[PDB]
Structures are given as structure tokens and as C-alpha cells.
Amino acid sequence: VVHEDFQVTEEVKALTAEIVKTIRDIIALNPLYRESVLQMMQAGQRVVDNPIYLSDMGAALT
Amino acid sequence: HLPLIAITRNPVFPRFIKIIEVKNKKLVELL
Amino acid sequence: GAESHELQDVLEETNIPKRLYKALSLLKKEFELSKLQQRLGREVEEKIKQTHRKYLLQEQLK
């Protein structure tokens, strides 16, 4: 399970932000699943200890 | 003289309306 | 979209010009990061679009 990441964990999450925004837009314009999962899992809550899993879930929604 | 509010990752920018939601019920008694 | 640490650093500054300059620098850095992400996304998006439009025609045929 390769999870190489840069030591600068400051600007990387910026892309994450974009991703989540995109995801939000999609679910707003193309409602596929409930938004309750979005409320439970929020990037601002610091509970996403595995951002790779969040990205994989987002790509799954596609 | 009140206990520090559990921010729980709820930033409050100056002069910005924000909503705080902490799962802990202990803050309910204080409120 | 600056991190809470950046906001605290701005609040640390006392002189009005100093805090204003720090805020402007943070704005510039956030704009640079957002522009980098947007350009990079656009490049990836065109790379998708590099797929010959026959993919759109196939999608319409289906």
C-alpha cells in the first residue's frame, strides 16, 4: 500500500479542496447519493486520517 | 470565567457568521 | 483558504501596515496556488479532450 506523500502538507490539501468542491457540484447538479455522508465526513473536521481513501471514494462516485 | 469552548475544528473568522456543532453534550449544560 | 495558522500569524502582527502587507501576501500565495491548480486541472482536462471526438459520437450513438 504505497502512500508516498510530500513533507509539505500545506499546499497538497488545496487540490483536495478542489476535488471536494467538484464532488459537491456534481452531487448538487447530479444527485446520486445522499448528502448525509458529506455532512458526516467533512474535510474541515480533521477526521480524514486517510485522504487517499477520501479520494478513492470521490473517484468511486464518478 | 467559563471553560474554553471546544472548537472542534470550527474556525470563526472576524466579523463572520459561523455555526458551532460539537457532538459532546457537556457544552449543552453550560449553554 | 489560508490555514488557521496563517490567520493566527496575521493576528499576531500589531502594526496596521504590517498586518495588511501580511494579508496581501497571503492573498497572493492563495491566488498563486489556486491558479496553479486551475491551470493544472485545465491541462489534464484538455488531455482528456485529446481523446478524439469519436468518443463523444460513440456516447451519442449509445
CA-nearest residue to B10 within chain C is C4
Identify how the structure was determined: cryo-EM
In this complex, is the C-beta atom of C4 within 8 Å of any C-beta atom belonging to chain B? yes
Q: Chain C residue closest to A18 (CA)? A: C37
C-alpha A61/C-alpha A25 separation (Å) is 12
What angle in degrees, to the nearest 10, is found between the helix axes of C4-12 and C16-49?
Answer: 160
Q: Is B8 left (phi over 0), alpha (psi -120 to 50) or beta?
A: left
Q: Which three cell numbers stand for residue C6?
A: 496563517
In the block, residue with C-alpha cell 469519436: C54
Neighbours of chain C (3+ CB pairs under 8 A): A, B
Element (H, E) at C45: helix C16-49
String of DSSP letters for A9-56: TTTHHHHHHHHHHHHHHHHHHS--S-THHHHHS-GGGT--S-HHHHHH
Establish how many alpha carbons lie within 13 A of residue A2's alpha carbon, considering only the half-sphere containing its beta carbon.
2
Closest CA to B20 of B4, B29, B8, B2: B8
- Count Cβ atoms below 10 Å from residue B12 Cβ, excluding itself: 12
Question: Coil, strand or helix: which one is A21?
Answer: helix
Residues of A in contact with B8 (CB under 8 A): 45
B11 in contact with C at a CB cutoff of 8 Å?
A: yes
Fill in the DSSP letter of residue C29: H
First to last CA, chain A: 23
Residues A41 and A54 sit within 8 Å (Cβ to Cβ)? yes
**How many CA atoms within 13 Å lie on the side-chain side of C52?**
2
Contacts of C37 by beta carbon, 8 Å cutoff, 6+ apart: A14, A15, A18
What's the rounded Cα separation, in Å, for the pair B11 and C13?
19
Q: Do A14 and C3 touch (CB under 8 A)?
A: no
Sign of CA dihedral C34, A17, A6, A8: positive
Which residues touch A46 (CB under 8 Å, ≥6 apart)?
A: B9
Nearest CA to CA, how far is A42 from chain B (Å)?
Answer: 10
> Beta-carbon neighbour count of residue B26 at 10 Å?
10
Instruction: Give the experimental resolution in Å.
Output: 8.5
Which of chain B's residues have a Cβ under 8 Å away from the Cβ of A45? 8-9
Tell me which chain B residue has its CA closest to the CA of residue A45.
B9
**Is A44 touching B (CB cutoff 8 A)?**
yes
With beta carbons less than 8 A apart as the criterion, state whether C33 and A11 touch: yes
- Cα separation, C37 vs A54, whole angstroms: 19
**Contact at 8 Å (CB) between B11 and C7?**
yes
